[PDB]
Coordinates of C-alpha atoms in Angstrom, one line a residue:
Chain A
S3 CA 110.8 58.0 177.3
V4 CA 109.8 61.0 175.0
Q5 CA 107.5 61.1 172.0
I6 CA 107.1 64.3 169.9
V7 CA 104.5 64.3 167.0
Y8 CA 104.7 67.5 164.9
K9 CA 101.8 67.1 162.3
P10 CA 100.3 70.5 161.4
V11 CA 98.0 70.4 158.4
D12 CA 97.4 73.3 156.0
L13 CA 94.4 73.1 153.7
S14 CA 94.1 77.0 153.3
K15 CA 93.5 78.9 150.1
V16 CA 94.6 82.5 149.3
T17 CA 93.0 84.0 146.2
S18 CA 92.8 87.3 144.3
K19 CA 90.0 88.1 141.8
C20 CA 90.8 91.6 140.4
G21 CA 89.7 93.6 137.3
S22 CA 86.6 92.8 135.3
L23 CA 85.2 89.3 135.9
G24 CA 82.1 87.7 134.4
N25 CA 80.3 90.9 133.1
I26 CA 77.7 90.8 130.3
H27 CA 77.5 93.7 127.9
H28 CA 74.5 93.4 125.4
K29 CA 74.3 95.8 122.4
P30 CA 76.2 98.7 124.1
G31 CA 76.9 100.5 120.8
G32 CA 73.6 101.8 119.4
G33 CA 71.9 105.1 118.5
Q34 CA 73.3 108.0 116.5
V35 CA 76.4 110.0 117.4
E36 CA 76.7 113.0 115.0
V37 CA 79.4 115.8 115.3
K38 CA 78.6 118.4 112.6
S39 CA 80.9 121.4 112.4
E40 CA 83.0 123.6 110.1
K41 CA 86.3 123.4 112.1
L42 CA 87.4 120.9 114.7
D43 CA 90.8 122.1 115.9
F44 CA 92.7 120.3 118.8
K45 CA 96.1 121.7 120.1
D46 CA 98.4 120.7 123.0
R47 CA 97.4 117.7 125.2
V48 CA 93.8 117.0 124.0
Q49 CA 92.0 113.6 124.5
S50 CA 88.8 113.2 122.4
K51 CA 86.3 110.4 122.1
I52 CA 83.3 110.5 119.7
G53 CA 80.9 107.4 119.8
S54 CA 83.8 105.2 121.0
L55 CA 83.5 102.1 123.3
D56 CA 86.4 101.7 125.7
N57 CA 86.9 98.8 128.3
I58 CA 90.1 99.3 130.4
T59 CA 91.2 97.1 133.3
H60 CA 94.4 98.2 135.1
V61 CA 95.5 95.8 137.9
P62 CA 98.7 96.8 139.7
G63 CA 97.2 95.0 142.8
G64 CA 95.9 91.5 143.3
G65 CA 99.3 90.1 144.5
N66 CA 99.5 87.4 147.2
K67 CA 102.2 86.9 149.9
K68 CA 102.1 83.6 151.8
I69 CA 104.8 83.0 154.5
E70 CA 105.0 80.0 156.8
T71 CA 107.7 78.9 159.2
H72 CA 108.0 75.6 161.1
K73 CA 110.6 75.2 164.0
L74 CA 110.9 72.1 166.2
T75 CA 113.9 72.5 168.6
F76 CA 114.8 69.5 170.9
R77 CA 117.6 69.6 173.6
Chain B
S30 CA 114.5 56.5 174.2
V31 CA 113.4 59.4 172.1
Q32 CA 111.0 59.5 169.1
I33 CA 110.5 62.6 166.8
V34 CA 107.8 62.5 164.0
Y35 CA 108.0 65.7 161.9
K36 CA 105.2 65.2 159.3
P37 CA 103.7 68.6 158.5
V38 CA 101.3 68.5 155.5
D39 CA 100.6 71.4 153.0
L40 CA 97.7 71.0 150.6
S41 CA 97.3 74.9 150.3
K42 CA 96.7 77.0 147.1
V43 CA 97.7 80.6 146.2
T44 CA 96.0 82.0 143.1
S45 CA 95.8 85.3 141.2
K46 CA 93.0 85.9 138.7
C47 CA 93.8 89.4 137.3
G48 CA 92.6 91.4 134.2
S49 CA 89.5 90.6 132.2
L50 CA 88.1 87.1 132.8
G51 CA 85.0 85.4 131.4
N52 CA 83.2 88.6 130.2
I53 CA 80.6 88.5 127.3
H54 CA 80.3 91.3 124.8
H55 CA 77.4 90.9 122.4
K56 CA 77.1 93.2 119.3
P57 CA 79.1 96.1 120.9
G58 CA 79.6 97.7 117.5
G59 CA 76.3 99.3 116.3
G60 CA 74.7 102.7 115.5
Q61 CA 75.9 105.5 113.3
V62 CA 79.0 107.5 114.2
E63 CA 79.3 110.5 111.8
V64 CA 81.9 113.3 112.1
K65 CA 81.3 116.0 109.5
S66 CA 83.6 119.1 109.2
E67 CA 85.3 121.2 106.6
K68 CA 88.6 120.8 108.7
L69 CA 89.9 118.4 111.2
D70 CA 93.2 119.7 112.6
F71 CA 95.1 117.9 115.4
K72 CA 98.4 119.3 116.7
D73 CA 100.8 118.4 119.5
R74 CA 99.9 115.4 121.8
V75 CA 96.4 114.7 120.6
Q76 CA 94.6 111.4 121.2
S77 CA 91.4 110.9 119.2
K78 CA 88.9 108.0 119.0
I79 CA 86.0 108.1 116.5
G80 CA 83.6 105.1 116.6
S81 CA 86.5 102.8 117.8
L82 CA 86.2 99.8 120.1
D83 CA 89.1 99.3 122.5
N84 CA 89.7 96.5 125.1
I85 CA 92.8 97.0 127.2
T86 CA 94.1 94.8 130.1
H87 CA 97.2 96.0 131.8
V88 CA 98.4 93.8 134.7
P89 CA 101.6 94.8 136.5
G90 CA 100.1 93.0 139.5
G91 CA 98.9 89.4 140.2
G92 CA 102.3 88.1 141.3
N93 CA 102.5 85.4 144.1
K94 CA 105.2 84.9 146.7
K95 CA 105.1 81.6 148.7
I96 CA 108.0 81.2 151.3
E97 CA 108.2 78.2 153.6
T98 CA 110.9 77.2 156.1
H99 CA 111.3 74.0 158.1
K100 CA 113.8 73.4 160.9
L101 CA 114.2 70.4 163.1
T102 CA 117.3 70.8 165.5
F103 CA 118.1 67.9 167.8
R104 CA 120.8 68.1 170.6
Chain C
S8 CA 118.3 54.8 171.0
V9 CA 116.9 57.9 169.1
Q10 CA 114.4 57.8 166.1
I11 CA 113.9 60.9 163.9
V12 CA 111.2 60.7 161.1
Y13 CA 111.5 63.9 158.9
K14 CA 108.7 63.5 156.3
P15 CA 107.1 66.9 155.5
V16 CA 104.6 66.7 152.6
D17 CA 103.9 69.5 150.1
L18 CA 101.1 69.1 147.5
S19 CA 100.4 72.9 147.4
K20 CA 100.0 74.9 144.2
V21 CA 100.8 78.5 143.2
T22 CA 99.1 80.0 140.1
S23 CA 98.8 83.1 138.0
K24 CA 95.9 83.8 135.5
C25 CA 96.8 87.3 134.2
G26 CA 95.6 89.2 131.1
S27 CA 92.4 88.4 129.2
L28 CA 91.0 84.8 129.8
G29 CA 87.9 83.1 128.4
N30 CA 86.1 86.3 127.2
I31 CA 83.5 86.1 124.4
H32 CA 83.1 88.9 121.7
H33 CA 80.2 88.3 119.4
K34 CA 79.9 90.6 116.3
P35 CA 81.9 93.5 117.9
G36 CA 82.4 95.1 114.4
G37 CA 79.1 96.7 113.3
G38 CA 77.4 100.1 112.4
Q39 CA 78.6 102.9 110.2
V40 CA 81.6 105.1 111.1
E41 CA 81.8 108.0 108.6
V42 CA 84.5 110.8 108.9
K43 CA 83.7 113.4 106.2
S44 CA 85.8 116.5 105.6
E45 CA 87.6 118.5 102.9
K46 CA 90.8 118.5 105.1
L47 CA 92.3 116.1 107.6
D48 CA 95.6 117.4 109.2
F49 CA 97.4 115.5 112.0
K50 CA 100.8 116.9 113.2
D51 CA 103.4 115.9 115.9
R52 CA 102.5 113.2 118.5
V53 CA 98.9 112.5 117.2
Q54 CA 97.2 109.1 117.9
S55 CA 94.0 108.6 115.9
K56 CA 91.6 105.6 115.7
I57 CA 88.6 105.8 113.3
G58 CA 86.2 102.8 113.4
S59 CA 89.1 100.5 114.6
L60 CA 88.8 97.5 116.9
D61 CA 91.7 97.0 119.3
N62 CA 92.4 94.2 121.9
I63 CA 95.6 94.9 124.0
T64 CA 96.9 92.7 126.9
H65 CA 100.1 93.9 128.6
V66 CA 101.2 91.7 131.6
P67 CA 104.5 92.8 133.3
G68 CA 103.1 91.0 136.4
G69 CA 101.8 87.4 137.1
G70 CA 105.3 86.2 138.2
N71 CA 105.6 83.4 140.9
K72 CA 108.3 83.0 143.5
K73 CA 108.3 79.7 145.5
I74 CA 111.0 79.2 148.1
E75 CA 111.3 76.3 150.5
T76 CA 114.2 75.4 152.9
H77 CA 114.5 72.2 154.9
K78 CA 117.1 71.7 157.8
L79 CA 117.5 68.7 160.0
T80 CA 120.5 69.1 162.3
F81 CA 121.5 66.4 164.8
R82 CA 124.2 66.6 167.6
Chain D
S20 CA 55.6 75.9 108.1
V21 CA 57.7 79.0 107.3
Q22 CA 57.0 81.1 104.2
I23 CA 59.3 84.2 103.5
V24 CA 58.4 86.4 100.4
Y25 CA 61.0 89.0 99.8
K26 CA 59.8 91.2 96.9
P27 CA 61.0 94.8 97.4
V28 CA 60.1 97.0 94.4
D29 CA 62.0 100.0 93.1
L30 CA 60.3 102.0 90.3
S31 CA 61.7 105.4 91.4
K32 CA 62.9 108.0 88.8
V33 CA 65.9 110.2 89.3
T34 CA 66.8 113.2 87.1
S35 CA 69.7 115.6 87.4
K36 CA 70.9 118.3 85.1
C37 CA 73.9 120.6 85.8
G38 CA 75.0 123.5 83.6
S39 CA 78.6 124.3 84.7
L40 CA 80.5 122.4 87.5
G41 CA 83.7 123.7 88.9
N42 CA 85.4 125.2 85.7
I43 CA 88.2 127.8 86.1
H44 CA 87.9 130.7 83.6
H45 CA 91.1 132.6 83.9
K46 CA 91.3 135.8 81.7
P47 CA 93.5 138.4 83.4
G48 CA 93.4 141.5 81.2
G49 CA 96.7 143.0 82.6
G50 CA 98.7 144.0 85.6
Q51 CA 101.3 141.5 87.2
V52 CA 102.0 139.3 90.2
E53 CA 105.4 139.7 91.9
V54 CA 106.9 137.4 94.5
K55 CA 110.4 138.5 95.7
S56 CA 112.3 136.5 98.4
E57 CA 116.0 137.1 99.2
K58 CA 117.5 136.0 102.6
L59 CA 115.4 133.0 103.7
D60 CA 116.9 130.6 106.3
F61 CA 114.7 127.5 107.1
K62 CA 116.0 124.6 109.4
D63 CA 114.5 121.6 111.4
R64 CA 110.9 120.7 110.4
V65 CA 109.9 124.0 108.6
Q66 CA 106.8 124.0 106.4
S67 CA 106.6 127.3 104.5
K68 CA 104.5 128.9 101.7
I69 CA 105.1 132.4 100.2
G70 CA 102.9 134.0 97.4
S71 CA 99.8 131.6 97.1
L72 CA 97.6 132.7 94.2
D73 CA 96.0 129.3 93.3
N74 CA 92.5 128.9 91.7
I75 CA 91.1 125.6 93.0
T76 CA 87.8 123.7 92.6
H77 CA 86.2 120.9 94.6
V78 CA 82.6 120.2 93.2
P79 CA 81.3 116.7 94.2
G80 CA 77.7 118.2 94.2
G81 CA 74.8 118.6 91.6
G82 CA 73.9 114.9 91.5
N83 CA 71.3 113.3 93.7
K84 CA 72.3 110.6 96.3
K85 CA 70.2 107.8 97.8
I86 CA 71.4 105.4 100.4
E87 CA 68.8 102.6 100.8
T88 CA 69.2 99.5 103.0
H89 CA 67.0 96.5 103.7
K90 CA 67.5 93.5 106.0
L91 CA 65.0 90.8 107.0
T92 CA 66.5 88.7 109.9
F93 CA 64.7 85.5 110.8
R94 CA 65.5 83.5 114.0
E95 CA 69.0 84.9 114.5
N96 CA 70.2 83.0 117.6
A97 CA 73.4 83.7 119.7
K98 CA 74.4 81.9 122.9
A99 CA 77.5 82.6 125.0
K100 CA 78.7 80.7 128.2
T101 CA 81.5 81.4 130.6
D102 CA 82.5 79.0 133.4
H103 CA 85.7 79.1 135.6
Chain E
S19 CA 52.5 78.8 110.8
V20 CA 54.8 81.8 110.0
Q21 CA 54.3 84.0 106.9
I22 CA 56.5 87.1 106.3
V23 CA 55.7 89.3 103.3
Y24 CA 58.4 91.9 102.6
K25 CA 57.1 94.1 99.8
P26 CA 58.3 97.7 100.4
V27 CA 57.7 99.9 97.3
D28 CA 59.6 102.9 96.0
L29 CA 57.8 104.9 93.4
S30 CA 59.4 108.2 94.3
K31 CA 60.4 110.9 91.7
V32 CA 63.5 113.0 92.4
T33 CA 64.5 116.0 90.2
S34 CA 67.6 118.2 90.6
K35 CA 68.7 121.1 88.4
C36 CA 71.7 123.3 89.0
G37 CA 72.8 126.3 86.9
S38 CA 76.4 127.0 88.0
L39 CA 78.1 125.1 90.9
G40 CA 81.4 126.3 92.2
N41 CA 83.2 127.9 89.2
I42 CA 86.0 130.4 89.5
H43 CA 85.8 133.4 87.0
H44 CA 89.2 135.0 87.6
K45 CA 89.1 138.1 85.4
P46 CA 91.4 140.9 87.0
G47 CA 91.6 144.0 84.7
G48 CA 94.8 145.4 86.2
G49 CA 96.4 146.6 89.4
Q50 CA 99.2 144.6 91.1
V51 CA 100.0 141.9 93.7
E52 CA 103.4 142.1 95.5
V53 CA 104.8 139.8 98.1
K54 CA 108.2 140.8 99.4
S55 CA 110.2 138.8 102.0
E56 CA 113.8 139.4 103.2
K57 CA 115.6 138.1 106.3
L58 CA 113.2 135.3 107.4
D59 CA 114.6 132.8 109.9
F60 CA 112.5 129.6 110.7
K61 CA 113.6 126.7 113.0
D62 CA 112.0 123.8 114.9
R63 CA 108.4 122.9 113.8
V64 CA 107.5 126.2 112.2
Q65 CA 104.5 126.3 109.9
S66 CA 104.3 129.6 108.0
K67 CA 102.1 131.2 105.2
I68 CA 102.8 134.7 103.8
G69 CA 100.8 136.5 101.1
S70 CA 97.9 134.1 100.1
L71 CA 95.3 135.3 97.6
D72 CA 93.8 131.8 96.6
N73 CA 90.3 131.4 95.2
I74 CA 89.0 128.1 96.5
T75 CA 85.6 126.5 96.1
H76 CA 83.9 123.6 97.9
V77 CA 80.4 122.7 96.5
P78 CA 78.9 119.3 97.6
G79 CA 75.4 121.0 97.4
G80 CA 72.6 121.4 94.8
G81 CA 71.3 117.8 94.7
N82 CA 68.8 116.1 97.0
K83 CA 69.9 113.5 99.6
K84 CA 67.9 110.6 101.0
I85 CA 68.8 107.9 103.5
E86 CA 66.2 105.1 103.7
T87 CA 66.8 102.1 106.1
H88 CA 64.4 99.2 106.6
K89 CA 64.8 96.3 109.0
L90 CA 62.4 93.5 110.0
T91 CA 63.8 91.3 112.8
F92 CA 61.8 88.2 113.6
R93 CA 62.6 86.2 116.8
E94 CA 66.2 87.4 117.4
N95 CA 67.5 85.6 120.6
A96 CA 70.6 86.3 122.6
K97 CA 71.5 84.4 125.8
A98 CA 74.5 85.0 128.0
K99 CA 75.7 83.1 131.1
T100 CA 78.6 83.7 133.5
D101 CA 79.5 81.2 136.3
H102 CA 82.6 81.4 138.5
Chain F
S6 CA 49.5 81.8 113.7
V7 CA 52.0 84.6 112.7
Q8 CA 51.5 86.8 109.6
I9 CA 53.8 89.9 109.1
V10 CA 53.0 92.1 106.2
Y11 CA 55.7 94.8 105.5
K12 CA 54.5 97.1 102.7
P13 CA 55.7 100.7 103.3
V14 CA 55.1 102.8 100.1
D15 CA 57.3 105.8 99.0
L16 CA 55.3 107.9 96.5
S17 CA 57.2 111.1 97.3
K18 CA 58.0 113.8 94.7
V19 CA 61.1 115.8 95.5
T20 CA 62.2 118.8 93.4
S21 CA 65.3 121.1 93.7
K22 CA 66.4 124.1 91.5
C23 CA 69.6 126.1 92.3
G24 CA 70.8 129.1 90.2
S25 CA 74.3 129.7 91.3
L26 CA 75.9 127.9 94.2
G27 CA 79.2 129.0 95.6
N28 CA 80.9 130.6 92.6
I29 CA 83.9 133.0 92.9
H30 CA 83.7 136.0 90.5
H31 CA 86.9 137.9 90.8
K32 CA 87.2 141.0 88.6
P33 CA 89.3 143.6 90.5
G34 CA 89.7 146.6 88.1
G35 CA 92.8 148.1 89.8
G36 CA 94.4 149.1 93.2
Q37 CA 97.1 147.1 94.9
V38 CA 97.9 144.3 97.4
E39 CA 101.3 144.6 99.1
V40 CA 102.6 142.1 101.7
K41 CA 106.1 143.1 103.0
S42 CA 108.0 141.1 105.7
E43 CA 111.6 141.9 106.7
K44 CA 113.0 140.2 109.9
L45 CA 110.8 137.3 111.0
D46 CA 112.3 134.9 113.5
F47 CA 110.2 131.7 114.3
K48 CA 111.2 128.7 116.5
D49 CA 109.7 125.7 118.4
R50 CA 106.1 125.1 117.4
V51 CA 105.2 128.4 115.7
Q52 CA 102.1 128.5 113.4
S53 CA 102.0 131.8 111.5
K54 CA 99.8 133.4 108.8
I55 CA 100.5 136.9 107.3
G56 CA 98.6 138.8 104.6
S57 CA 95.6 136.5 103.7
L58 CA 93.1 137.7 101.1
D59 CA 91.7 134.2 100.0
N60 CA 88.2 134.0 98.6
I61 CA 86.9 130.6 100.0
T62 CA 83.4 129.2 99.5
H63 CA 81.7 126.2 101.2
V64 CA 78.1 125.3 99.9
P65 CA 76.6 122.0 101.0
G66 CA 73.1 123.6 100.7
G67 CA 70.4 124.0 98.0
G68 CA 68.9 120.5 97.8
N69 CA 66.4 118.9 100.2
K70 CA 67.4 116.3 102.8
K71 CA 65.4 113.3 104.1
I72 CA 66.3 110.6 106.6
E73 CA 63.7 107.9 106.8
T74 CA 64.1 104.8 109.1
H75 CA 61.7 101.9 109.6
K76 CA 62.3 99.0 112.0
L77 CA 59.8 96.3 113.0
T78 CA 60.9 93.9 115.8
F79 CA 58.9 90.8 116.5
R80 CA 59.7 88.8 119.7
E81 CA 63.3 89.9 120.3
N82 CA 64.7 88.1 123.4
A83 CA 67.8 88.8 125.5
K84 CA 68.6 87.0 128.7
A85 CA 71.6 87.4 130.9
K86 CA 72.7 85.4 134.1
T87 CA 75.7 86.1 136.3
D88 CA 76.6 83.7 139.2
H89 CA 79.7 83.6 141.4

């Protein structure tokens, strides 16, 4: 007489938390920004920021791969 | 006499939380921004931000893959 | 006599939360933005933001792939 | 309980006088201006100017400017909650 | 309990006088201006300017400027909570 | 309990006088200007300027400038909690 019980239990959790989570920003814009000139003159490939607020999250990551295999072979 | 009981249990979870989640921004616009010139002159490939607020989330990621296989072979 | 009981159980879950979720923005427009000149001249491939508010979510990601295969073979 | 008295007073006096603002007086007594062009060839996205002799005025001045701002803020409350 | 008296006073006197702002008196007695162009050849994204003798004036000045900002803030409250 | 009295007084006297600001007087009696161009050849993203004799004037001055700022803050509260 033969009895096989195959009863594995998976309660696991796989989680990613990526980028900006749960932050508090209080009054971040304040105070003077003054740019006084005669000429501003920007040519090829210029990036300029004057008194700007800029929140960027770039998330190429945070991916999850979960692989499971079950084999019972009886002969 | 042979008895096989194949009863695997999966209660698992696979999760991505990606980008900007649950952030608080309180009064982020405030203060003077002043740009004073006789000329502003912007030519090829210029990016300019004056007093702007900018929230960007780019998420190429956060994908989930969940592969499972079951075999019972009896001979 | 042979008895086979193939009864695998799947209550698992696969989830994506991608982009901007549950964020709070309170009075984000505020303060003076003043741009003051006798000439503004923007030419080829110029991007300009003056006092603008901008929320961008781009999500190429967040995709889910769930694969399961079940084989019972009896000989 | 709460008493707010908001009684700002303006009694200011502003005076401006301007004689001449931004006039063009244009009294050429003689001579000439000559602009000759003969074999021009302009193609994709050309901007061109030949023989500029403009008389131009921009006079936003002479007057006085006041910016005046008041705010009284009483018990401004904000509350923000995130849970996940 | 709470008394706010907001009684700012402006009694200021502001006086401007300007004689001439930003006029052009173009009064040439004689001579000449000549601009001559022949075989000009302009293609992709050319900006060009040949022979400019403009008289141009920009006068935002002469007058007085004041900025005057008042704020009174009483019991401003912000509260922020994150849980996760 | 709480009494706020906000009584700033401006009694300022401000005076400007300007004679001439930023005029062009242009009375050439004679002579010449000549701008000759014969075989110009301009392509991708040329900016060019030839023979400039412009009279240009920028006068924001002459008047007095004041920036005056008042803030009174009574019991401003901010509180922030993060938990995870």
